[PDB]
Design a protein around this ligand. Sequence first.
Ligand SMILES: *[C@@H]1O[C@H](CO)[C@@H](O[C@@H]2O[C@H](CO)[C@@H](O[C@@H]3O[C@H](CO)[C@@H](O)[C@H](O)[C@@H]3O)[C@H](O)[C@H]2NC(C)=O)[C@H](O)[C@H]1NC(C)=O
Lengths: 48, 193
Amino acid sequence: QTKLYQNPTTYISVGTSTLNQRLVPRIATRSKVNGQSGRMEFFWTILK
Amino acid sequence: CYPGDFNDYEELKHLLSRINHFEKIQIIPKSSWSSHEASLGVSSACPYQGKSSFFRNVVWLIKKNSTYPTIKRSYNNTNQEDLLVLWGIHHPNDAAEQTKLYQNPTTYISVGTSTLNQRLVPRIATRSKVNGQSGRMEFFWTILKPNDAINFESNGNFIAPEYAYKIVKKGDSTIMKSELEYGNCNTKCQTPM
Ligand SMILES: *[C@@H]1O[C@H](CO)[C@@H](O[C@@H]2O[C@H](CO)[C@@H](O[C@@H]3O[C@H](CO)[C@@H](O)[C@H](O)[C@@H]3O)[C@H](O)[C@H]2NC(C)=O)[C@H](O)[C@H]1NC(C)=O
């Protein structure tokens, strides 16, 4: 996490009329897919 | 018997609808527990022959000397069957019991298969007293595909597996909800009455 983003503690906060979200990245030891370990979890929404 | 909840309980029982036979295998020996104390995870909430005792296919790890060093253990399903494996977190009744049992102010659990990304945080809180106790155990589960590893890591409040469950015979069944006990007959049709 230092390598890539500096800040130790981190978040994401996406906000609209309805949506009120705030995300926190979970560090965890986990098995390797596609020469890769860390995961990326995507989200979505329909902006009226 | 020690109160709490079973996360995604019904989704499991339904999955148990298709299984005709288990085989319990040992994934983490109780003996092999390192620099913790596996022996003293018992509670009067769960009595066995007059003494205090606990669940049998998990183990309720307590701190050693006066420390709880970060757990970092794994297991590869080199069997050729799907593996059902259950763990659990403890939720304490206060900060007093937090240090008293597990040692540390803040704790987390981190299990991770090839498709699991869990990070669990116990919740302290006041609550009404069930079966003597008012802390809670919240249990969890997953299925492990062949040749998949599953890596745990936690610095407290962690109820670890000893035994997992091999799905041997897969097929048809239901979790039938009758109150009659067996009558040594044989049929081709069964109904709860
Ligand atoms: C858990 O144990 C299983 C069983 O040993 C491990 O699976 C095996 O992993 C090896 C590599 O370490 C696989 O070999 C690979 O084969 C491909 C194509 O043939 C080759 O190009 C690669 O260089 C690699 O050597 C092997 O097939 C695989 N066994 C099977 C049948 O699944 C596994 O590594 C462990 N679990 C994990 C990945 O966490």
